[PDB]
Ligand binder design. Structure first.
Ligand SMILES: [Zn+2]
Ligand SMILES: [Zn+2]
Lengths: 301, 303
């Protein structure tokens, strides 16, 4: 345990340039002149993010496996001399962190598992002073990561465990990392949540989605998470919409969090077309035949 | 157990285009008009290889995570209808392989573990007909992958077992798999089962002691040695301060000197040290056993 690390989970902005502007707002405001790391999902993201941050005036350097040894030592020296402020790295990192004053490690995408997020965020605050660990959570990142870690052993479970972390809005972050491996003095984003919480019933929200999928399989169709959301919100190809299913009066990112809820509790299940995720009826959809069964998710009152 | 797959390991050409030409000669040699998969280590590997294969007349398609739905379906559609012959893919694959006639699976780079290689090479021969799984093994691939798997709990040990599979030239390929899985009839469907040679047991203990001199001297010179620098010092090349007086460069080929160091690494006479994606070789946990003048290190070599 590292008591000097403040764990925080933010909602990933759906627009790419809105996301980067928010990062630049943090790099220039809160972290002016402080070294940090930005972890990414692939090598292209690390390069794509580095380009944007550099255009906005941030001294950033990409770091992935396909870097030549000459360019790695370059980023090493410059970042260790604080001449480069942030290394926009990939998972090709971690073990060679002789930097004690890492003040923030932002996650442009969620980690493949909680053990990985502990290691990657663990690069922050090695000097035992205060440091922040931001984790930007996006619905789509669940599926571009799942198809890659599904072939690993228990890898899909290790990702849904990472999803539960980002979904949780009340339990302490350090408890959400500790008991996966089985004294946070208000040092995370959920402990400082003074607000109260309600348990919301979203059972018919689940039965409506099963209507959309049963009809889809009767139409010889497979629904990606976007197609399911679009049909839910009364958009997309009209034949996939179910007559009687009302588009909820909630934000899109709130409907994403509900589908990810049904996924990790296995009311829905993932099916693949190799790097393409399709949502299907899950093993726990059976329990919805009891007219009294109910599904709950914690909201803010 | 897939008894219709011929597993074989080949040495990876250190020259880039020489490797591609070898692959092209195989795609247009016995795999003409046959669908296959080329597995790579990263996204850029798949794109760089896809370009080189295309410019030589091969219908190839890159595939990784940072594609797009419009581009993924296009690859699925083209490649499932035999319009594309090979998909140059990263580990971003899986159960989408409803194609049952994959006839050859080539790994442009070594896998990260034995599970991944049994899973990635398992994309071939789904229709139970004969299919080939050719694994090219390169010394430098150990350290492109090791940086990404050290933080994955037991990723280093799982990669070193994948290296052991590549270093083996006697044990049956299906045997080497099964013992990893704790499982319990190859029918001469692997390269080592089809070998007709006898194998010499060679003592390389002094080769280990010689390298340990090179590493002990590099520490007193305030120097960390990459695997390349360790070999170049061994071969009497590179920086002159880093070669040790009396350590003679062996009369073995370069790739034979890599296999010896790879043996010492996976047997923990040497160990890895990182500067995050830059791997350094250092004295390992078992080099202390070399105080015993009777302790010997051996390696099976061809006769
Ligand atoms: Zn807390
Ligand atoms: Zn055999």
């Amino acid at each position: 345990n590292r008591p000097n690390l403040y764990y925080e989970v933010r909602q990933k902005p759906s627009n790419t340039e809105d996301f980067i502007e928010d990062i630049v707002k943090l790099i220039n405001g809160r972290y002016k002149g402080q070294s940090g790391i930005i972890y990414c999902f692939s090598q292209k993201d690390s390069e794509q993010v580095t380009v944007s941050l550099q255009n906005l005036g941030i001294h950033a350097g990409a770091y992935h496996a396909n870097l030549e040894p000459e360019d790695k030592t370059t980023v090493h020296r410059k970042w260790s001399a604080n001449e480069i402020q942030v290394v926009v790295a990939t998972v090709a990192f971690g073990m060679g962190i002789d930097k004690p004053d890492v003040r923030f490690v932002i996650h442009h995408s969620m980690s493949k598992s909680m053990e990985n997020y502990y290691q990657e965020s663990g690069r922050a605050g090695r000097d035992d002073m205060k440091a922040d660990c931001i984790l930007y959570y996006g619905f789509g990142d669940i599926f571009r990561i799942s198809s890659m870690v599904v072939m690993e052993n228990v890898g899909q479970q290790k990702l849904y465990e990472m999803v539960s972390y980002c979904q949780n809005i009340s339990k302490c972050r350090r408890v959400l990392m500790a008991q996966h491996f089985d004294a946070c003095n208000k040092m995370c984003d959920n402990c400082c949540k003074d607000s109260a919480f309600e348990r919301k019933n979203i059972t018919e929200y689940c039965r409506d989605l099963i209507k959309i999928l049963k009809q889809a399989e009767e139409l010889n169709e497979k629904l990606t998470p976007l197609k399911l959301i679009d049909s839910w919100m009364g958009k997309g190809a009209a034949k996939l919409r179910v007559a009687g299913v009302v588009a909820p009066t909630l934000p899109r990112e709130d409907l994403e969090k509900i589908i990810a809820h049904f996924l990790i509790q296995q009311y829905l299940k993932e099916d693949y077309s190799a790097a393409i995720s399709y949502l299907k009826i899950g093993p726990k959809a059976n329990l919805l035949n009891n007219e009294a069964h109910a599904i709950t998710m914690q909201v803010t009152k």
